[PDB]
Amino acid sequence: SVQAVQVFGKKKNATAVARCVQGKGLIKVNGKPLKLFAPEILRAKLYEPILILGTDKFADVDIRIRVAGGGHTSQVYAVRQAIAKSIVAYYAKYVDEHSKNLLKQELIQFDRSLLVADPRRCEPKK
Amino acid sequence: MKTNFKFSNLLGTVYCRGNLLFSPDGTHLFSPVGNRVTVFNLVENKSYTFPFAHRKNISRIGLTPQGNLLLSIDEDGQAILTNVPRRVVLYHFSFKSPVTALAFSPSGRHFVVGLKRKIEVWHVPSTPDTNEDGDLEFAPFVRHHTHMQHFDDVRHLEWSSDSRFFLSASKDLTARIWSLDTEEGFVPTVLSGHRQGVVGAYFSKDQETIYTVSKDGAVFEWKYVAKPGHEDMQWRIVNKHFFMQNAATLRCAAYHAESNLLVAGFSNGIFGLYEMPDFNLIHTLSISQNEIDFVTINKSGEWLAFGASKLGQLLVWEWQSESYILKQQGHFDAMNSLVYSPDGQRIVTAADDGKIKVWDVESGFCIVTFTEHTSGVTACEFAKKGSVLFTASLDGSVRAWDLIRYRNFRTFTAPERLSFTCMAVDPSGEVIAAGSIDSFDIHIWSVQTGQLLDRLSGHEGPVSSLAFAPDGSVLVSGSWDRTARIWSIFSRTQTSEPLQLQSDVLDVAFRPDSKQIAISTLDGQLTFWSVSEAQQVSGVDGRRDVSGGRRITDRRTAANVAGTKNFNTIRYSMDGTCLLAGGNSKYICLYSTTTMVLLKKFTVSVNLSLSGTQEFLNSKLMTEAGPVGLLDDQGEASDLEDRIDRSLPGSKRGDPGARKKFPEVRVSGVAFSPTGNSFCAASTEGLLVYSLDNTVQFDPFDLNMEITPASTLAVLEKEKDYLKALVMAFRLNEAGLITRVYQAIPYTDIGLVVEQFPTVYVPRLLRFVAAQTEQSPHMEFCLLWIRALIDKHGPWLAANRGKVDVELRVVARAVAKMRDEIRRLADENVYMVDYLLNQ
Amino acid sequence: GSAIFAPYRTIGLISPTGVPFTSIPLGKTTFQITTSVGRALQTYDLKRGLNLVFVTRPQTPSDITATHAWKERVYAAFGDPRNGEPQGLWVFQRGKKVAELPLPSDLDQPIKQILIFGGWIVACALTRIEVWKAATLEHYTTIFPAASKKGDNELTGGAINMPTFLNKIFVGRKDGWVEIWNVSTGKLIYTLLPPSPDCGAVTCLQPTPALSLLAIAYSGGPLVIQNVLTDKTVLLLEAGTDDAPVTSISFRTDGLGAGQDGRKDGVMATATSVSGDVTFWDLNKGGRIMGVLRSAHNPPSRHNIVRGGISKIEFLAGQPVIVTSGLDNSLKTWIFDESPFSPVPRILHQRSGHAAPVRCLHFLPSDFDGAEGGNKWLLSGGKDRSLWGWSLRRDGQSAELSQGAIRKKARKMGLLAGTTTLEDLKAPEITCIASSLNRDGGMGAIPGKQMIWDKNAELSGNTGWESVVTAHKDDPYARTWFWGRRRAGRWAFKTGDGEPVSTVAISSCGTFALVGSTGGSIDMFNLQSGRHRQRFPSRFAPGTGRHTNAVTGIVVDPLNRHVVSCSLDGKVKFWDFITGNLVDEIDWAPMTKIIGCRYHPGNDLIAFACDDRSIRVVDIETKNTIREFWGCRGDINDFCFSPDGRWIVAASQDSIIRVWDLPTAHLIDAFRLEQPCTALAFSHTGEYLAGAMEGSLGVQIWTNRTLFRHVPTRQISESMMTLSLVPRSRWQTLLHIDIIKARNKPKEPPKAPEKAPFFLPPVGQNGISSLIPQETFTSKLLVGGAKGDYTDFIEHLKALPPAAADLELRSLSIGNGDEATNELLHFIRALTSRLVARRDYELTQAWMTVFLRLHFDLIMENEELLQALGEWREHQARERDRLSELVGYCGGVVSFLRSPRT
Amino acid sequence: TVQAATKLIEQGHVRVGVEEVRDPAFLVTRNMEDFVTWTVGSKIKQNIMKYRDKLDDF
Amino acid sequence: KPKPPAPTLTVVSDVATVAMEDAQPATAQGVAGGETSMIAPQEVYAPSKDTAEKGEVVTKAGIPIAKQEMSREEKLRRRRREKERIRKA
């Protein structure tokens, strides 16, 4: 009955659950707002999907994120991955596939790591 | 380029279940291929396919004795008649029962048809081709008579020579004689006395003796002689004689009455032909291992045409010369892969039968069948040179054939035994990479050395698609570890850059200008990556665009069937602007690589005898025992070799048993043509060649208001401004007008026209003169055109080289035709004449 | 007539006329129901649904006014000669005319009904009965009823037979009299008078299932059932109002259905022509009424455009079903239930059509290459507010795209009894439609039931959303329709300006639906989510490109790059898609006022129809008009393209349809219609054109004659070394015919018997092959050498099979020792002549190759032809130096230009 | 259980390798027992991920 | 796992490639194609020591040189090269 989408985000050892529901427009990380949770210089890494997609896409959703593990940098990268993948999955399920494809195209044109986490394996020059 | 693809000829299969036919001239051979009818012109090597398509497989072909009208019957009796000179569909009409016999009258006014027990003689409809002031009627067929004086299947119908009587041969062991209208000294008599049912009843030339050939292998003569007690005569039997084919029953016989000879094809594949009225065995031989299904004879009488249904196996036999005219074989398994030749004249396909064969695009015949693989053949590939073909297969060997000598100069194996399922080859032709499902390493051999260079590794799963870059610097592998690899092999450092994806990689393809690559995953999405800076630049989510399904034995809705929602194979255009994508589904998608939209979607088959060709099956075919196309009906067969089920339980990939009732629709390989303007796709029905339609569609380039064909010919003939007339014709884009002005300007003003011609119309002009060299008999004129064009616009084409690559390729193969066809003969003639003149 | 379009069939038309149907029982299981198109008859089967069995050909020259259906044949009487038209009576069988009836010379009356019995067929015209004998189909006599007044002679009602009465017809007059006429001797035998003579005219009469009881129905209201030999009234029923006279009556011959339990017989249905409700009587006690089936068809209104009435009632023979046919293009069959007692029946079969003329037409886009093609589904929006999907393949699989439970709403309102009407319960009349089945989900489009026109997207993306968008007459919403489900879609898009819709369009990808108001505003909606995406213009200078007048004809590029939108007042504007800003305008403002546009995908051409009676074709890529067409003498009603793009067809208000060749910029044909055409639609492949006329309900299908026979019509109206043509295959296997026959020999030989048949029978034309063309090749060559020209010998040798060519090239010889008798020297001189004339280079080289290959010994040992070889070598060396330099230059430079970096 | 497994591979949740398998008699060899797994859009796969609380809706 | 590779030899003739082609009315090759004799000049004739003359030797170049005309220095060098190959094996 309720519109709800749960999306994970991943870095070295920092993981993020983001549940996106129908709402008024808030984004909370660990119960505190997104403008509070980061080091003061990496908030520009957090605001990257919102500024790519515009605020009109985030006008309708409410995203709640939990993070665990990692350091400050790994947790910030996990939060921005959870934000981007979360709004793309909500627009996949509950509005049109053309809007899903437009959001995916804008995010992939900026940075692919907002959608697909690339782990660093060990394969040096063999 | 213009993505306006109609359906050109089917190819890759030469015969399927159905009747064979000759033209009344004797040259064209009409053969049914699934639900279409190919015409093989045999006097000049050509072939085409009629534009219709039946919903089920062809049951019957008939042809009006004038030659013009063809009438094709599907299963369940849906008939399409069409005009063979102007290849257009004329009438659709449904006989409500499955047609099991059909014969047109030699006068041309009637045709008789046997629906299982019934015998209906119909009128032949009046057509717009034959009347001056006439049109399509609504219901054109007028029934003349119906006869149900019969007890079982009508297996044959044969008219007289004066077209007043006909004979119906049966399955209730009795041939009958019928009339068209009520004659004076006639009763519709029966001809009883057989043992296993008549195959065919035939008249003689002077219609006194009529012959009956039955299924057990016995042919009887029938004459109108008096009863042995002597107005009082009876159609009785004068002599009987038997084909002594030992352990077989004859499946189809024919009888040429003008020359008096009878041919019979038997269940063990050995046919025999006999000069009938004294029954001297002319000869006999074994054309097929399986059986012979349908025999027809030439109108002249000098050619025979046999068709076996279980394989492709169509062959025409010239009996007095004792030699084949053609002996052709389609694939009897799933066509696994295909590639065009880099010239573009011939394509080569590799199926799971174990054979690979090289079909010619014109004339539709296979020209060589390489048969050294002992298991199913997967991917085949060419080099840039086009003379060498490398084929991988499941018997563990990547073989390497040379097509100027037709022998595998190399065979490669892995030391531990693998079964290769995918392969790529460097465009230099010196390195072969191949990958399998058993080991996750990816093997590399050298062509000029023969031994194994390396086993590259770094994949956590079996490697599914390999592609060498067309410049020659980068191998790309794609594997079920959700990963792809940019292998750089040829540099001094051998490196591997991974591309992490979301699901298992199914296909990898390059752009021709090698900066881009498209990889198709198992989600159903295409991702366009860059190879220099390895970042995804584009993407299509294409599940809905290809999802067309619901096979029989499928308890999901066609929208919920996963497995037919991915792209198994993708190929760029030779332009590089449009992908073409095909999977295990009914639809072929044609995407744009820049604007990321689906330009055009195609449907491979209308054929309802295949399994997955409509996404909403109807509830009429669902009984209370499952669907109606699922009950095992082998037990209702007259022949033991048809009744025996030698099938293995749970064998998806081929078994020699191969029940194969209602096979699935899947596009296992697609390829664009290197000359442009065509692609083709290996379906299960055949090998469909789609091509652009430019002659049946008006499409100007950049037109003004005062530019008509009348104005173009006016500035040609009156004003004599040849460059203006030619630019106006290329601007109108009508091929007849372009040909008219092109032939009309003179060969001394060619140079002035080319010197002042525009560079926006240069590539269209190069393509046009390439087509005119390959088709028209004005060879020195077109070569002066090509010479003036390249001598004037030399540095522009060499500067571009990517925008004009297809135009240069088709010009190159046009001058390759003229270089190999006439000047070798001219040189050999002048050297032979010089020697014979020097004694 | 025309030179391109030939008439095929009026489709979408089952019963439009006042001519009642006729039912014949086939066997014990089928009934044939035969109705009148107006120029033909349609026979449907009842057990097989009501799918069309036969339609009648050829089309009769006038309107059919009477019909009957005997054993197999259908008799059809046509033509009212009181106004011009020719008349006749024709006998059809299986939809083809098998016989004609000889009408009398002095027959100047329409022919109201036909009646076949005994061996006699009987035609009641107006005041006159013409009777033929059926076994020979010959004229017998003519019955003339007589009257004292002018009016009372008129034979309204008709004549019917009683079943056990030998050779007697029962005619009804305009006076109340029913006159019995013995049709053998042509004699008036009895007359029976109306009871209570205020009731004036016999409206109908029908035989009961009782013997010698006839049911006469008078215009003053009473139904009587009377013994017709006792002349005594059995029942008298006040069955009609004086304004609503009983017109059709029919009795149930089943044996049950009355008496408030259903196990007693005696039921009669009746209908008046001014109502649309049938009435059932139980005749048992006094003849009470038992039920009224209300609004079985549309009730006819003189003020409304929708037609209506009931033309005929027929109980079928011994069965519960009742077949009724109305004037509102509809045929229904109802059935009485058995186990619960139903006084009124329930509907089991129905076919229908438009109850009004057809307003707009649209052939559906092609299922990508499937069995539908472009030419199966037509989509017709009528003036009776319904959108029908017609099928040209089978006429039984065409069904109305339903707007919801309209008949359930009209029965739960008081719309079936007697406020608005059932047509007014629907969406308004359709102005235009545009559809794209790239995302039509078939039957399972959105599973479950959805709301209709409302004013969850994972399942929509999996299966498929709406397909058709539809602009209606004066409503501000542009409705949407599922196509594959055949129902109304779940969205209804408002304009944004508030003004009513003027045009609507759909994207090629099937996602976006663009509405364009009559006030100027253009809006774009996503059809999957039903949401407003982009407005044109958004909010040249960006933000200001808005139209000032109505928007007719928007259309989207198939690449989703531009949308080109056309104003009423003046200009055409190309907008960017994803931005919503104006890119480029073209202004024909002070001189034109554009009333429509059509677009051709695959050609990039747009055709605008302006108000100066002209059509301007513009290339959308170069943005300049390329073809203007000036032919119309009225306003352009509807115009369309050809799928090749080569023609544009325009139907104007002057009732002339004009075809323009677009490459030649000329007229081709212009044919005059009987009524002005209101809508045109060409199929997406080239066979069918469809025109919806003015006045006629149901569209007219024309075929395209140019696809089948070539027409030469272009009539502008107002009211060097060459090769040969010889096949490459032929001469290239002449050059190689030893190894080709060696590969064509089988591996194992044929198992010929020991007693082999010597002297096989001769096949081919006279002992040789049938490919050698019939009328001595040495005689040809030597008479060609006696003359100067070898063209006869060369044109003979060209048209040979390769085996016969190798034979006639191996069978040359020196012979007698003269220069005029040897074939070798003349063959060399013939090839020398062809090298001089520069005609057949490839064939000359192939012929010389095989000639030198099989004759080198004689030409080496002989000196009489080494001079000819020297002259041949001179010409050959010149020509091969020139041609080899040419082809080597082109080959080497092309191979360099393909890869210049080594 | 084998009964539930035959029901699941008749409903078509199981692929072997890259191709979905609808036949419940497909003989799985020793090196394809490493490649039998669920299909792409499987509700059974969503059930397993929803149990393990790793339900990624992307 | 397919099978162990076991040696199989195929005897090709000296016929043209249009004898390996399939049965059809005319060849797909042109007029230049159809003279390629399906075995290379190296299989028609290769000069080697087993097919040389008695007095002569053949070199690695495929050229007949006689032992009588060969000098002492070239004899010594050819003995050293054959001994070098023997030491390599």
PDB file of C-alpha atoms in Angstrom, chain B residues 27 43-45 55 86 88-90 128 132 135-139 259 280-282 284-286 300-301 319-320 322-324 544 559 587 595 597 599 601 603 606 616 696-700 702-705 707-709 747 777 779-781 783-784 787 790 794 798 801 811-812 815 818 822-823 825-826 829-830 832-833 836-837, chain C residues 6 8-9 55 96 368-369 371 439-444 461-463 559 561 600 602-603 622 624 626-627 644 646 663-664 707-710 720-725 727 729-730 735 744 746 750-751 753 755 757 760-761 763-764 770-771 841 845 849 852 859-860 872-873 876 880 883 886-887 889-890 893-894 897-898 900-901:
ATOM      1  CA  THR B  27      14.375 -23.170 -65.273  1.00  0.00           C
ATOM      2  CA  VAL B  43      19.756 -20.675 -65.887  1.00  0.00           C
ATOM      3  CA  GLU B  44      21.298 -17.554 -64.370  1.00  0.00           C
ATOM      4  CA  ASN B  45      22.398 -18.175 -60.797  1.00  0.00           C
ATOM      5  CA  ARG B  55       1.008 -18.387 -40.417  1.00  0.00           C
ATOM      6  CA  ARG B  86       5.183  -8.892 -60.329  1.00  0.00           C
ATOM      7  CA  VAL B  88       2.902  -9.264 -55.159  1.00  0.00           C
ATOM      8  CA  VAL B  89       0.322 -10.902 -52.917  1.00  0.00           C
ATOM      9  CA  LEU B  90      -3.010 -11.138 -54.668  1.00  0.00           C
ATOM     10  CA  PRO B 128      -5.905  -7.920 -62.568  1.00  0.00           C
ATOM     11  CA  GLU B 132      -7.495  -4.934 -68.978  1.00  0.00           C
ATOM     12  CA  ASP B 135      -9.823  -5.152 -60.198  1.00  0.00           C
ATOM     13  CA  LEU B 136      -9.729  -7.272 -57.067  1.00  0.00           C
ATOM     14  CA  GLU B 137     -13.070  -8.893 -56.368  1.00  0.00           C
ATOM     15  CA  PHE B 138     -14.133  -9.721 -52.831  1.00  0.00           C
ATOM     16  CA  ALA B 139     -14.530 -13.519 -52.888  1.00  0.00           C
ATOM     17  CA  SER B 259       8.085 -39.285 -72.682  1.00  0.00           C
ATOM     18  CA  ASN B 280      12.665 -51.380 -67.999  1.00  0.00           C
ATOM     19  CA  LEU B 281      14.681 -50.113 -65.043  1.00  0.00           C
ATOM     20  CA  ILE B 282      16.533 -47.122 -66.463  1.00  0.00           C
ATOM     21  CA  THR B 284      18.287 -46.219 -59.503  1.00  0.00           C
ATOM     22  CA  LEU B 285      20.451 -44.601 -56.835  1.00  0.00           C
ATOM     23  CA  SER B 286      20.493 -43.424 -53.229  1.00  0.00           C
ATOM     24  CA  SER B 300      10.477 -31.006 -70.723  1.00  0.00           C
ATOM     25  CA  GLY B 301      11.196 -34.272 -68.910  1.00  0.00           C
ATOM     26  CA  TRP B 319      19.034 -38.495 -65.483  1.00  0.00           C
ATOM     27  CA  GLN B 320      20.273 -38.992 -69.032  1.00  0.00           C
ATOM     28  CA  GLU B 322      23.500 -39.067 -64.887  1.00  0.00           C
ATOM     29  CA  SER B 323      24.577 -36.016 -62.887  1.00  0.00           C
ATOM     30  CA  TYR B 324      23.284 -33.628 -60.271  1.00  0.00           C
ATOM     31  CA  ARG B 544      10.585  -4.338 -22.607  1.00  0.00           C
ATOM     32  CA  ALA B 559       5.475 -10.284 -19.725  1.00  0.00           C
ATOM     33  CA  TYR B 587      12.100  -9.186 -31.788  1.00  0.00           C
ATOM     34  CA  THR B 595      20.591   9.386 -29.504  1.00  0.00           C
ATOM     35  CA  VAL B 597      16.556   5.459 -28.985  1.00  0.00           C
ATOM     36  CA  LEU B 599      14.923   3.320 -34.347  1.00  0.00           C
ATOM     37  CA  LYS B 601      11.980  -3.145 -34.182  1.00  0.00           C
ATOM     38  CA  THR B 603       9.645  -9.475 -36.074  1.00  0.00           C
ATOM     39  CA  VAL B 606       5.064 -14.882 -38.380  1.00  0.00           C
ATOM     40  CA  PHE B 616      -0.831 -14.112 -26.262  1.00  0.00           C
ATOM     41  CA  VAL B 696       9.989   1.689 -53.632  1.00  0.00           C
ATOM     42  CA  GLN B 697      10.150   4.887 -51.563  1.00  0.00           C
ATOM     43  CA  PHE B 698      10.459   8.549 -52.504  1.00  0.00           C
ATOM     44  CA  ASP B 699      13.106  10.209 -50.321  1.00  0.00           C
ATOM     45  CA  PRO B 700      14.721  13.446 -51.498  1.00  0.00           C
ATOM     46  CA  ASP B 702      17.516  18.557 -49.890  1.00  0.00           C
ATOM     47  CA  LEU B 703      14.947  19.519 -52.492  1.00  0.00           C
ATOM     48  CA  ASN B 704      13.754  22.832 -53.923  1.00  0.00           C
ATOM     49  CA  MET B 705      10.442  23.653 -55.579  1.00  0.00           C
ATOM     50  CA  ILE B 707      13.186  20.460 -59.332  1.00  0.00           C
ATOM     51  CA  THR B 708      11.132  17.782 -61.109  1.00  0.00           C
ATOM     52  CA  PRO B 709      12.115  14.921 -63.418  1.00  0.00           C
ATOM     53  CA  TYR B 747      32.847  10.607 -71.380  1.00  0.00           C
ATOM     54  CA  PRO B 777      27.248  -3.250 -68.924  1.00  0.00           C
ATOM     55  CA  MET B 779      32.203  -0.896 -67.637  1.00  0.00           C
ATOM     56  CA  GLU B 780      34.704   1.491 -69.225  1.00  0.00           C
ATOM     57  CA  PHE B 781      32.299   4.386 -68.640  1.00  0.00           C
ATOM     58  CA  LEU B 783      35.700   3.077 -64.620  1.00  0.00           C
ATOM     59  CA  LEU B 784      36.360   6.500 -66.161  1.00  0.00           C
ATOM     60  CA  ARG B 787      39.120   7.279 -61.992  1.00  0.00           C
ATOM     61  CA  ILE B 790      39.388   9.468 -56.992  1.00  0.00           C
ATOM     62  CA  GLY B 794      41.879  12.026 -53.566  1.00  0.00           C
ATOM     63  CA  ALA B 798      42.164   9.734 -47.493  1.00  0.00           C
ATOM     64  CA  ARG B 801      38.567   7.389 -44.178  1.00  0.00           C
ATOM     65  CA  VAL B 811      34.121   0.676 -55.028  1.00  0.00           C
ATOM     66  CA  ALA B 812      36.985  -1.691 -54.166  1.00  0.00           C
ATOM     67  CA  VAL B 815      36.972  -2.982 -59.328  1.00  0.00           C
ATOM     68  CA  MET B 818      36.461  -6.154 -62.979  1.00  0.00           C
ATOM     69  CA  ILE B 822      37.986  -9.683 -67.531  1.00  0.00           C
ATOM     70  CA  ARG B 823      41.645  -8.716 -67.282  1.00  0.00           C
ATOM     71  CA  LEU B 825      41.230 -13.503 -69.365  1.00  0.00           C
ATOM     72  CA  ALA B 826      42.594 -10.683 -71.525  1.00  0.00           C
ATOM     73  CA  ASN B 829      44.535 -14.669 -74.127  1.00  0.00           C
ATOM     74  CA  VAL B 830      47.221 -12.269 -75.304  1.00  0.00           C
ATOM     75  CA  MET B 832      48.536 -17.613 -75.472  1.00  0.00           C
ATOM     76  CA  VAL B 833      48.063 -15.826 -78.805  1.00  0.00           C
ATOM     77  CA  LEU B 836      50.842 -19.621 -80.805  1.00  0.00           C
ATOM     78  CA  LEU B 837      51.889 -16.832 -83.164  1.00  0.00           C
TER      79      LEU B 837
ATOM     80  CA  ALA C   6     -11.085   0.646 -57.443  1.00  0.00           C
ATOM     81  CA  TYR C   8     -13.632  -3.115 -52.815  1.00  0.00           C
ATOM     82  CA  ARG C   9     -16.235  -3.240 -49.999  1.00  0.00           C
ATOM     83  CA  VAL C  55     -21.432 -11.030 -49.205  1.00  0.00           C
ATOM     84  CA  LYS C  96     -22.555 -14.611 -56.907  1.00  0.00           C
ATOM     85  CA  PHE C 368       6.426  -4.292 -36.341  1.00  0.00           C
ATOM     86  CA  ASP C 369       6.507  -6.897 -39.055  1.00  0.00           C
ATOM     87  CA  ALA C 371       0.725 -10.887 -38.973  1.00  0.00           C
ATOM     88  CA  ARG C 439       3.990   0.022 -25.928  1.00  0.00           C
ATOM     89  CA  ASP C 440       0.614  -1.641 -26.483  1.00  0.00           C
ATOM     90  CA  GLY C 441       0.632  -4.514 -24.035  1.00  0.00           C
ATOM     91  CA  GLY C 442      -1.908  -6.672 -25.827  1.00  0.00           C
ATOM     92  CA  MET C 443      -4.642  -8.166 -23.669  1.00  0.00           C
ATOM     93  CA  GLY C 444      -2.635  -8.028 -20.466  1.00  0.00           C
ATOM     94  CA  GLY C 461       6.808  -1.009 -17.494  1.00  0.00           C
ATOM     95  CA  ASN C 462       6.746  -4.800 -17.455  1.00  0.00           C
ATOM     96  CA  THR C 463       3.575  -5.162 -19.520  1.00  0.00           C
ATOM     97  CA  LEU C 559      14.064  10.542 -32.993  1.00  0.00           C
ATOM     98  CA  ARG C 561      14.434  15.628 -31.323  1.00  0.00           C
ATOM     99  CA  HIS C 600       5.593  10.910 -43.239  1.00  0.00           C
ATOM    100  CA  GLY C 602      10.840   7.482 -43.108  1.00  0.00           C
ATOM    101  CA  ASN C 603      10.686  10.440 -45.493  1.00  0.00           C
ATOM    102  CA  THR C 622      15.975  21.779 -44.477  1.00  0.00           C
ATOM    103  CA  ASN C 624      11.800  25.056 -46.631  1.00  0.00           C
ATOM    104  CA  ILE C 626       9.391  21.922 -51.512  1.00  0.00           C
ATOM    105  CA  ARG C 627       6.036  21.218 -53.214  1.00  0.00           C
ATOM    106  CA  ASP C 644       6.117   5.238 -50.431  1.00  0.00           C
ATOM    107  CA  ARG C 646       5.058   9.172 -53.867  1.00  0.00           C
ATOM    108  CA  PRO C 663       8.188  13.664 -57.179  1.00  0.00           C
ATOM    109  CA  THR C 664       6.704  14.779 -60.501  1.00  0.00           C
ATOM    110  CA  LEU C 707       0.298  -2.482 -56.915  1.00  0.00           C
ATOM    111  CA  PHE C 708      -1.197  -5.198 -59.114  1.00  0.00           C
ATOM    112  CA  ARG C 709      -1.344  -3.871 -62.677  1.00  0.00           C
ATOM    113  CA  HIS C 710       0.871  -1.072 -63.906  1.00  0.00           C
ATOM    114  CA  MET C 720      33.771   2.756 -74.981  1.00  0.00           C
ATOM    115  CA  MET C 721      34.399  -0.915 -74.242  1.00  0.00           C
ATOM    116  CA  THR C 722      31.078  -2.360 -73.108  1.00  0.00           C
ATOM    117  CA  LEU C 723      30.118  -5.759 -71.763  1.00  0.00           C
ATOM    118  CA  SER C 724      27.041  -7.754 -72.721  1.00  0.00           C
ATOM    119  CA  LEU C 725      23.690  -8.425 -71.096  1.00  0.00           C
ATOM    120  CA  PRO C 727      24.467 -13.773 -67.578  1.00  0.00           C
ATOM    121  CA  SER C 729      26.751 -17.556 -64.718  1.00  0.00           C
ATOM    122  CA  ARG C 730      26.274 -18.666 -68.333  1.00  0.00           C
ATOM    123  CA  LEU C 735      34.709 -21.168 -69.555  1.00  0.00           C
ATOM    124  CA  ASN C 744      28.260 -32.645 -60.566  1.00  0.00           C
ATOM    125  CA  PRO C 746      27.778 -38.326 -58.096  1.00  0.00           C
ATOM    126  CA  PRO C 750      23.831 -45.083 -60.425  1.00  0.00           C
ATOM    127  CA  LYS C 751      23.139 -48.800 -60.168  1.00  0.00           C
ATOM    128  CA  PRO C 753      21.001 -52.937 -64.550  1.00  0.00           C
ATOM    129  CA  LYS C 755      20.093 -55.682 -69.173  1.00  0.00           C
ATOM    130  CA  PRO C 757      17.542 -50.196 -71.651  1.00  0.00           C
ATOM    131  CA  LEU C 760      15.886 -44.470 -73.877  1.00  0.00           C
ATOM    132  CA  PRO C 761      12.721 -42.515 -74.760  1.00  0.00           C
ATOM    133  CA  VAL C 763      13.100 -36.137 -73.750  1.00  0.00           C
ATOM    134  CA  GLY C 764      13.372 -32.476 -74.570  1.00  0.00           C
ATOM    135  CA  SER C 770      14.561 -27.503 -74.285  1.00  0.00           C
ATOM    136  CA  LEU C 771      16.857 -24.548 -73.574  1.00  0.00           C
ATOM    137  CA  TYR C 841      34.457  -7.745 -74.293  1.00  0.00           C
ATOM    138  CA  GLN C 845      37.660 -13.046 -74.125  1.00  0.00           C
ATOM    139  CA  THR C 849      40.022 -18.558 -74.220  1.00  0.00           C
ATOM    140  CA  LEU C 852      42.468 -21.417 -78.143  1.00  0.00           C
ATOM    141  CA  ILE C 859      45.910 -22.948 -85.523  1.00  0.00           C
ATOM    142  CA  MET C 860      49.567 -23.709 -84.843  1.00  0.00           C
ATOM    143  CA  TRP C 872      43.139 -10.079 -83.418  1.00  0.00           C
ATOM    144  CA  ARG C 873      46.315  -9.684 -81.374  1.00  0.00           C
ATOM    145  CA  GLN C 876      43.375  -7.097 -78.361  1.00  0.00           C
ATOM    146  CA  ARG C 880      43.851  -4.522 -73.110  1.00  0.00           C
ATOM    147  CA  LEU C 883      41.577  -1.227 -70.090  1.00  0.00           C
ATOM    148  CA  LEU C 886      42.369   1.869 -66.294  1.00  0.00           C
ATOM    149  CA  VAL C 887      41.334  -0.920 -63.924  1.00  0.00           C
ATOM    150  CA  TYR C 889      44.889   2.507 -61.692  1.00  0.00           C
ATOM    151  CA  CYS C 890      41.487   2.470 -59.992  1.00  0.00           C
ATOM    152  CA  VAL C 893      44.573   4.060 -55.867  1.00  0.00           C
ATOM    153  CA  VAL C 894      41.486   2.730 -54.060  1.00  0.00           C
ATOM    154  CA  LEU C 897      43.145   5.428 -50.090  1.00  0.00           C
ATOM    155  CA  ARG C 898      41.563   2.724 -47.931  1.00  0.00           C
ATOM    156  CA  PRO C 900      47.469   5.009 -46.468  1.00  0.00           C
ATOM    157  CA  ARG C 901      49.400   4.528 -43.187  1.00  0.00           C
TER     158      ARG C 901
END
